[PDB]
Amino acid sequence: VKVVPSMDAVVKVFCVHTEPNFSLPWQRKRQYSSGSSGFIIGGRRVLTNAHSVEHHTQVKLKKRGSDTKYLATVLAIGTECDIALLTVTDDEFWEGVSPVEFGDLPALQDAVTVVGYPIGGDTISVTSGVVSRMEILSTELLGLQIDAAINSGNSGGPAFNDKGKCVGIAFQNIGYVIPTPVIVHFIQDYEKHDKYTGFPVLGIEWQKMENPDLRKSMGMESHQKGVRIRRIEPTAPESQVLKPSDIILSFDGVNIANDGTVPFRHGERIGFSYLISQKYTGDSALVKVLRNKEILEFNIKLAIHKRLIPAHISGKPPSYFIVAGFVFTTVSVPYLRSEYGKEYEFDAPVKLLEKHLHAMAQSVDEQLVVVSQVLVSDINIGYEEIVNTQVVAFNGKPVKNLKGLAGMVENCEDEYMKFNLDYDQIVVLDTKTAKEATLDILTTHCIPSAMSDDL
Amino acid sequence: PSMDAVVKVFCVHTEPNFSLPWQRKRQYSSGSSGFIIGGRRVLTNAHSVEHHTQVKLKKRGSDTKYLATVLAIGTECDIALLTVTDDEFWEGVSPVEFGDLPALQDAVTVVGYPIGGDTISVTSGVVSRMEILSYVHGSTELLGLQIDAAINSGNSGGPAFNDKGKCVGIAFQSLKHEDAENIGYVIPTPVIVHFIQDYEKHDKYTGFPVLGIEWQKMENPDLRKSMGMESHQKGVRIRRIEPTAPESQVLKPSDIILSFDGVNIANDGTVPFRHGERIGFSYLISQKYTGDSALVKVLRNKEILEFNIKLAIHKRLIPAHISGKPPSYFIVAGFVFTTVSVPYLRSEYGKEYEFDAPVKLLEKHLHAMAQSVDEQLVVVSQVLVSDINIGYEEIVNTQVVAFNGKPVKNLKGLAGMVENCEDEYMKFNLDYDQIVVLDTKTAKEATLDILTTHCIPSAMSDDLK
Amino acid sequence: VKVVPSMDAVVKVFCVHTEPNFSLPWQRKRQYSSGSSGFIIGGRRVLTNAHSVEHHTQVKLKKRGSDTKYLATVLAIGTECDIALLTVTDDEFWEGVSPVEFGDLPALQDAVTVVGYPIGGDTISVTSGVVSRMEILSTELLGLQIDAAINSGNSGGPAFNDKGKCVGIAFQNIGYVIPTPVIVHFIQDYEKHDKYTGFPVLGIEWQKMENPDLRKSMGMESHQKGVRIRRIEPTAPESQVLKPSDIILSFDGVNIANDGTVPFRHGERIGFSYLISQKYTGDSALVKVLRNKEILEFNIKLAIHKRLIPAHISGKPPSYFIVAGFVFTTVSVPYLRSEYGKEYEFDAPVKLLEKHLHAMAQSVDEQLVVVSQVLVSDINIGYEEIVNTQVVAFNGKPVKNLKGLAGMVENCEDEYMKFNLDYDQIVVLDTKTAKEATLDILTTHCIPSAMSDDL
Amino acid sequence: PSMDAVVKVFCVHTEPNFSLPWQRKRQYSSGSSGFIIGGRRVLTNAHSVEHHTQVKLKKRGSDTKYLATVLAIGTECDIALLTVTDDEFWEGVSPVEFGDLPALQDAVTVVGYPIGGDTISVTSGVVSRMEILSYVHGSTELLGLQIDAAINSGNSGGPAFNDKGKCVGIAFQSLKHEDAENIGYVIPTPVIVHFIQDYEKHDKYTGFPVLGIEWQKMENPDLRKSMGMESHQKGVRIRRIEPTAPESQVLKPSDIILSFDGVNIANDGTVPFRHGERIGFSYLISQKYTGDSALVKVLRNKEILEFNIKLAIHKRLIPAHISGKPPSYFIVAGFVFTTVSVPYLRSEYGKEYEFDAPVKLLEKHLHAMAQSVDEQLVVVSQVLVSDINIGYEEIVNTQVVAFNGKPVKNLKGLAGMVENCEDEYMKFNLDYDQIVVLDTKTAKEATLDILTTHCIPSAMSDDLK
């Protein structure tokens, strides 16, 4: 009724996905198709969910009542906010469409309308509901809950308030709407950096300052509030300027309490990291600390977090390096999940779990390198059962990352190759016959080359 | 023919509460099986009788329960040695007599009692394999018999017989098999003989020795060549040596162990055992006695060396058990400090503690070696809530690594530093880069009223007083 | 909407509980935390549920939108009405809060609002419902039922009518509200006695007077109505003045019918004990009786009931006394429930069930003393299986209570200690070696002393 | 070889209704097993034949049912002795022959019939233990055999055979074990012999005697010393003596029973039974006959005394059963007065009456002793509603303790006081400090019309007329 003038702006999203195999990183899995929804905004752009085009090899858009599926280009994917930004090069796709208009943040129990396409259908569907809750959840972000039906094909299409105005992106009985502040940050992030970069972090771990003796011992007067820095990420800018046991008092003039919270709305507080996540990569921020009982204030340029075991790899292919059937790769969350399933946080080896939960990258290029598996062959008799075990050294030299290991192997002139592994194990191979064995092993397993292109 | 010798064991237990180490749990009574042997002795499982305050024995045909005496406990081999002063118990019973180590597929008959019943039960099966296994999880691995039968509480602790009526050992309920799998274990006669002979010679249990090394197989030919091994040589590479074992003063990492007491060790760590049978080389070590010496031949820097090594029991950083002693603890200002052992982790996190305990603690349980004889993993177990510890109430099972700048080696070390602390503040460095800071004078003064609140008799276990 | 002006008066309740072990009365169980709600009233006071602070060792309150958890003091707990009264010594907790305002008793199907905090959250939640029923239930008291959701964390927070006014205390799909009359009695009881005392009783058992021959045989004329006294509690004041077979005719001028009921509202009656429960401990009341066919009227000062097997012990620690490993304690309902579980009223020994259901205390200090268990040791060989068996005498003298038994044991100079037990059993111990054995048994079981402090 | 002697028992029962004691329940027929023995006799369970109005017997190979005669019923040992006048039943059957008391673990074969079937069934098992047990709950405990087999109705009452084809007693379906537990009982040959010899000598069943005492173990050494017991002495202390047993005139509380008929009683109440076997001393008592005398040796005030005690059957305040007699009752003004027995409680409160009956009544069931030979627990069972008893309609199973100021000793006592009451009022004192008051003249006058309403033939059972 009030949503009808924007229904011509809601498009059907056809996607072919080709997922990499993280357990066999030289393979791509079988194509599969999905259907979703999306909608046109200002500036020759289309919004949909990130999961709608995850690992896309082809995306097509079909306007309402149109007979044509236009090839689309993905401009940017925002993994943390489940948003993708699409465009279509062809001018007739855009000819005479009125884009969606956004509206104000609704309150709870407001009437909301999700408009999209059912799976297997080209005709607009329209679901009604009310905002069940509003929660900073999942980087944690604002997200609306609704008591309604997101028909899976409906995911990616717009939610409308009881005027004509868009309230966000539906995504898949209850459902969720990605709210407009999140969308705003994604769009502005893309406009600032001509790509997606994410939501910045202060790369620090902190401890509450609630105990009186702890506070007094560090020189905090009774009116001061803040959190004590436990550790700082070595790869973060902050590491040059903040120090362990600094007490963080405020961020951009916002007072941080002893439990790490800042004011949010009347009767409500939230963690100070939420404040940081509304900044943009490259912004500066004023961090005020108590250090050795003196107040210091630093201007800190915010950066994206570098995780030792990356939570994802941004659609990049996984890397690998093979010699003599030893498959080396790097540990990431998609690797752990592909190796150990949904409960990897309990089933993976404790050595890797420790690094996953507690280790910080000590340099920007540090990777956790493992022997993933050993492709059995005469050259590697007696080593076949090594699985997901860290490589810490090669012929006496520390292994920093996968490219580093590969270069050391390639340039090795000693008679033997000697890999120090975790659990105090060693692997020793005759250098000449190990390099000679590789090619036949690649053929047997249909591996296109001994290493991924990025090496 | 032998069943009169198969007694029911009634045990009263008073267990420490590892989560609340100042308490003992309610008295409770359990039943299990045991059997009469020669010399006015009864054998049963160690576990049937742990934390005993009273043990009684009942024969199948008489209502009377006889007060028994516990002579020795062998936790690692799960054997208890009992006797009974009342002679009415012994009169008219033919003791069980022991047979040779069974062959694979030999028939075995396990005689005992069901849970809650006082009637004889009889389970039958075959010896399905030899095995080196831990009878207590995380403890020293010993010879054992895997059998086709099922062993459940009640009958573990009863004797297993071969088809000639001789006893081939003590039934043992599997720790890793669901009862429906029809899989159980028999503590065999050479382990029983080791336990009894050990007690007979030393008037006490002295354990089962270990070599104190981790090893890696030498099956790859390039590995063997690069380490100078002649083509006829075989054995295993030493990965790491326990710093608290004496042999950490003569063996070295990357030595290749070739033989042990003259027995040739293969590249997979096995030695010949019997006709057509091979077993892990540790069985040569565990059949020795604590304090015995052993000839270890290694290849070091391409040369053969021979050491005679005096063998000791294994000291684990996170112990598999603490020998029925009370768990140590110490309290100041409501902070409860204790040490991490396997019973502690089981009490805190349940039977699945190898998946649900904090990864920091699991790491040390699975992989850390004690760096010194008295090293212990000290944790803040919990905080007994009070005004003195506002802001800290949620600290749980978090290692303490330093006190006012000094490393914490063990619980008694920490207890001493706290008691002799003269500084204005007590500063505990905890895991996860956390610190706890307390005013020394008020922290000590707060302790008494907190103990009163939780009915804690003493700020510390007796071993720290 | 209409409740908003009072939402700043609703607080979050954090409690650490340390429960005594009634089966091992020298032990306190492991700390556990709970979260609840509560709300501010006039006079620097906070209301919440009794179960929210049961066995508290620490209570903290957090105002709405506040960053601070203030330590609270428990002023009074009313077990029978599930109410606790809290205060906070710190003045800034009270600075500028507008307390809750109470409203009139609602009718059924009225709109009601419960305001509180979800478990794990610091943000106010608001649940709506209607009054399902109104019932004198559980001392039996008024209590409202509502068709709504009390989120467990929500228990302790206020219920509001469809004006702005408080209708009671919510407690934990249906839920209950503790109504304002109950709250009023609790507050006024606390103000009268500077503690909680409870709801007084007439300590009498009664029989209906409905049969004509029974009435005529006792001289009741056809217009007289009342109930016949069966027994009177020896420890009640009434015992000095009322007699068995008195017919109670009226209480404070309220006529009591043959079935024990009094008028309540049009078309509704209720038991006369309800009338007594709205008095206060220490009030006087006029009880009119027929005795030997004459009308007598007594002024009776009301008192709290003394139960032989107490229904609870008011947060007091359980008592115990040990000699030579014999653990003596007193039988109470928490002991019976801890020993025999939820169905103790069927699983406990019939001897104790008889006393529990039917026995009256014959003196104010009478306790039912049992051997709870025997901590096995050489000194007590042959007695190990005695469990929960009454001790009726020590060396020829009746045992009246636990303190009495302990004094007799301490002052015993005979060669032997001789305990007469129930089921015609005796326990005999050498006095000297039994006293000498105790200490080692206390050590083995980690018992701090042979008796609880109250002895 | 013996199975032709194993007969099916068809019984017609006419049971009293204990809840409505003026009624008999509908006639119904049940099947069970029995077997032919020597002397033109058949044995079966007493319970298979209780309240019999007709019993028939069927052999396995013939359609014909033979009218049987019930010679004697032994409720306590659950044995019935039958015979059959028609000689066609007896012709060509070899009677069952009895064997000696089995040893533990001996094989037993139980021959009978399934429920509803007339084909032979055969169950096998082992003698798992000797036992002293009640065959009727709350009744006198007797020797019994526990067996590994399962006994269910149909087959109880069939014979149990040892491996030499001899009968070792009568199968008995357990009262305390669920049928899936594969646990049953055999009434053994010395109990059968006692029953048969008893009938043969006295022309009737005379029961199994008891001593009429409760006792406490003397295992604590301080207890024994304080009572003057020399170190070689052992036995049990008398807690309480039945006031209705003759021996309440010679034994005393706190006597220590040392021996019975010269057999030495231990501190746990056991006596030697066979090689390696001990049993409770009551088996010496129950194998005697009612009226036999027994030598009881006690320690009293540190001196040995010896009594020869004439033994009688046990009189229980709340009887375990009433010997197939009709339950007594008496009615006035609609009040139904009856006595409390175990069948009454079972009829009123179901199989779980030990948990669901009023605690007052349970107390007396479990712990009260009759204070006199004719004492009974008298209750108002119910009130047959009428104008005369307005206000009392809900009184249920509440003891009557006095009538117009005089104690109620038993039902006939109360019936007499009511009938001879000349006072204006009848005043019944009931439990829970309640009184019932009725006008004597109108109460008596109301009774007839109430009986008519409920079709009650008579205001009282015949035993009160």
Coordinates of N, CA and C in Angstrom, one line a residue, chain C residues 8 40 53 81 88 113 121-122 150 174 187 222 240 247 270 313 319 321 333 348 354 376-377 385 411 439:
Chain C
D8 N 13.0 4.1 36.8 CA 14.2 4.4 37.4 C 14.3 3.9 38.9
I40 N 12.7 0.4 44.6 CA 12.9 1.4 45.7 C 11.6 1.9 46.2
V53 N 17.4 -13.5 48.1 CA 18.6 -13.2 49.0 C 18.7 -14.3 50.0
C81 N 6.1 -15.0 53.4 CA 5.5 -14.2 52.3 C 6.5 -13.9 51.1
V88 N 20.7 0.3 51.4 CA 22.1 0.6 51.0 C 22.6 1.8 51.8
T113 N 1.6 -4.8 34.5 CA 2.9 -4.7 33.9 C 3.9 -5.1 35.0
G121 N 21.3 -9.5 31.8 CA 21.2 -8.2 31.2 C 21.0 -7.1 32.2
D122 N 21.5 -5.9 31.9 CA 21.3 -4.7 32.7 C 20.3 -3.8 32.2
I150 N 7.4 -14.1 33.8 CA 8.3 -13.6 34.9 C 9.7 -14.3 34.5
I174 N 2.7 -19.0 33.3 CA 2.0 -18.0 34.1 C 3.0 -17.6 35.2
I187 N 5.8 -5.0 56.0 CA 6.4 -3.7 56.3 C 6.0 -3.3 57.8
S222 N -29.6 -23.7 69.1 CA -29.7 -23.9 67.7 C -29.1 -22.7 66.9
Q240 N -2.8 -21.5 78.5 CA -3.1 -21.1 79.9 C -4.6 -20.8 80.1
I247 N -15.8 -24.6 72.9 CA -16.3 -24.3 71.5 C -16.0 -22.8 71.3
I270 N -14.3 -17.7 54.2 CA -12.9 -18.1 54.3 C -12.7 -18.6 55.7
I313 N 14.6 -22.6 59.8 CA 15.3 -22.1 60.9 C 15.8 -20.7 60.7
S319 N 22.3 -26.9 64.0 CA 23.2 -27.3 65.2 C 23.6 -28.8 65.1
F321 N 26.1 -31.9 67.5 CA 27.0 -32.2 68.6 C 27.6 -33.6 68.3
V333 N 12.3 -29.6 59.1 CA 11.9 -29.9 57.7 C 13.1 -29.8 56.8
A348 N 10.7 -40.6 54.6 CA 11.3 -40.5 55.9 C 10.8 -41.7 56.9
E354 N 5.5 -39.4 62.1 CA 4.5 -39.3 63.1 C 4.7 -38.0 63.9
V376 N 32.4 -43.7 61.2 CA 32.9 -45.0 61.6 C 34.3 -44.9 62.1
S377 N 34.6 -45.6 63.2 CA 35.9 -45.6 63.9 C 35.9 -46.8 64.8
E385 N 25.6 -48.5 61.6 CA 24.4 -48.4 60.8 C 23.3 -47.7 61.4
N411 N 29.4 -33.3 81.2 CA 29.5 -33.5 82.6 C 29.4 -34.9 83.1
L439 N 38.4 -36.3 68.8 CA 39.2 -35.3 68.1 C 39.8 -35.9 66.8

